Ligand binder design. Structure first.
Ligand SMILES: O=C(O)CCc1nc2ccccc2[nH]1
Length: 113
C-alpha cells in the first residue's frame, strides 16, 4: 500500500446529505433514490464511452473539487471519511469505483496515482 493515493471523484448530494447544498445548487432537492440513479447513469455512460469521468465531474459534481475536474489531490489514511478512504485505497491507478456512500452523499472515484 502506498502512503498516499491521488484520486478524482464525482459527488452527487441529496436532500438527506450532511450538507445539502453545493457550488452549483443552493439547496439540494433530489431524493437519495434520484442521486443513486444519477450515479449509476454516470457509471454506465463512462463504461460505454459516451461520457468522460473528468468532464462529468467538472459539470455535475456537488463537491467544489468540480473546478479541478474532480481532482482531490493526494491523501493518506485517516483524512477522508472511512468508506471513501477504503474504496480509494482498494482501486488500482486508472480504475473507477462503483457507488460509494459517505455522509456527504454518493460518489464514484477514479484513482489517478
Ligand atoms: O461540500 C461538501 O460539503 C464536501 C464535499 C465532499 N465530501 C467528501 C467526502 C469524501 C471525499 C470527498 C468529499 N467531498
Amino acid at each position: 500500500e502506498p502512503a498516499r493515493v491521488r484520486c478524482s471523484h464525482l459527488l452527487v448530494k441529496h436532500s438527506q446529505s450532511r450538507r445539502p447544498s453545493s457550488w452549483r445548487q443552493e439547496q439540494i432537492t433530489r431524493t437519495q433514490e434520484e442521486a443513486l440513479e444519477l450515479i449509476n447513469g454516470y457509471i454506465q455512460k463512462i463504461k460505454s464511452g459516451e461520457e468522460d469521468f473528468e468532464s462529468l465531474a467538472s459539470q455535475f459534481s456537488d463537491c467544489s473539487s468540480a473546478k479541478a475536474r474532480g481532482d482531490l489531490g493526494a491523501f493518506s489514511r485517516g483524512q477522508m471519511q472511512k468508506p471513501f478512504e477504503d474504496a480509494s485505497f482498494a482501486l488500482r491507478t486508472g480504475e473507477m469505483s462503483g457507488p460509494v456512500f459517505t455522509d456527504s452523499g454518493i460518489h464514484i472515484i477514479l484513482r489517478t496515482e
